[PDB]
Amino acid sequence: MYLPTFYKLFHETNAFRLKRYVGYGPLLLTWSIWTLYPALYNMIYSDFIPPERGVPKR
Amino acid sequence: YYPFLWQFFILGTSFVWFHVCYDPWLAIYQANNAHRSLETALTKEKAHKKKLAEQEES
Numbered sequence: 415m416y417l418p419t420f421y422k423l424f425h426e427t428n429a430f431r432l433k434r435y436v437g438y439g440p441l442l443l444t445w446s447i448w449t450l451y452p453a454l455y456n457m458i459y460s461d462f463i464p465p466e467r468g469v470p471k472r
Numbered sequence: 473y474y475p476f477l478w479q480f481f482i483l484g485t486s487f488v489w490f491h492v493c494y495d496p497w498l499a500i501y502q503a504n505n506a507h508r509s510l511e512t513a514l515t516k517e518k519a520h521k522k523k524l525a526e527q528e529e530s
């Protein structure tokens with residue numbers, strides 16, 4: 415007979431619930447990307463892609 | 473049947489709302505005021521400066 419410990423049942427239930435809730439992480443990420451998009455653009459092209467060095471002659 | 477996918481659908485509908493209510497008004501507003509831009513004034517000043525410079529004395 416299958417007599418799992420209640421520790422395991424609790425762990426598996428919480429694992430499933432965590433899986434369910436993680437699906438909204440992308441949702442909130444998209445919401446905060448559409449919102450505050452200028453901030454994301456500034457971050458991307460200031461830290462990950464630093465500007466070029468040289469300056470115009472004028 | 474996938475709640476987070478339906479939330480993405482709601483986000484898409486809100487995006488469509490924003491763009492529908494945004495693009496037409498902005499387009500018509502910036503089409504109406506095409507001749508009031510700073511570029512027109514700069515071009516007029518450049519033309520007048522050229523005309524004054526070509527015709528002058530020592």
Ligand SMILES: CCCCCCCCCCCCCCCCCC(=O)OC[C@H](COP(=O)([O-])OCC[N+](C)(C)C)OC(=O)CCCCCCCCCCCCCCCCC
Pocket residue numbers: 428429431432435
């Ligand atoms: C260092 C951080 C300090 C500042 C505080 C930061 C708070 C951040 C809050 C926002 C992000 C939350 C993300 C997790 C959300 C989980 C929701 C939930 O209910 O869980 C789903 C399910 C539970 O589903 P549920 O439906 O039963 O949810 C209800 C849960 N209770 C009853 C608690 C209200 O739980 C899980 O299995 C996942 C739990 C994730 C969170 C675990 C926290 C502890 C372990 C990781 C961190 C350890 C270090 C902590 C810092 C110590 C520093 C010395």
Ligand SMILES: CCCCCCCCCCCCCCCCCC(=O)OC[C@H](COP(=O)([O-])OCC[N+](C)(C)C)OC(=O)CCCCCCCCCCCCCCCCC
Pocket residue numbers: 433434436437438439440443473474475476
């Ligand atoms: C660089 C950008 C890359 C972007 C790539 C985007 C590509 C997206 C492609 C999606 C294809 C479709 C996938 C469908 C999955 C369905 C799963 C499912 O059944 O869900 C039900 C479950 C919950 O189910 P439920 O309980 O809500 O309902 C089930 C419905 N019935 C009952 C009818 C069956 O949800 C999940 O599985 C959610 C978890 C999986 C997805 C987690 C993704 C996390 C990503 C976090 C953001 C990372 C960003 C990058 C960070 C980089 C940092 C350096």
Ligand SMILES: CCCCCCCCCCCCCCCCCC(=O)OC[C@H](COP(=O)([O-])OCC[N+](C)(C)C)OC(=O)CCCCCCCCCCCCCCCCC
Pocket residue numbers: 474475478482
């Ligand atoms: C100017 C004054 C007057 C007009 C004000 C304009 C509205 C301002 C507030 C709008 C809030 C959004 C609409 C809520 C309406 C009720 C929806 C509802 O009952 O939920 C069911 C609906 C969906 O339920 P449903 O049952 O209809 O459909 C989904 C069901 N399935 C998947 C089975 C198909 O929920 C939503 O679609 C969105 C819920 C969002 C959470 C509710 C509170 C939002 C509060 C706003 C701020 C949120 C911030 C989040 C980020 C954290 C920031 C710190």
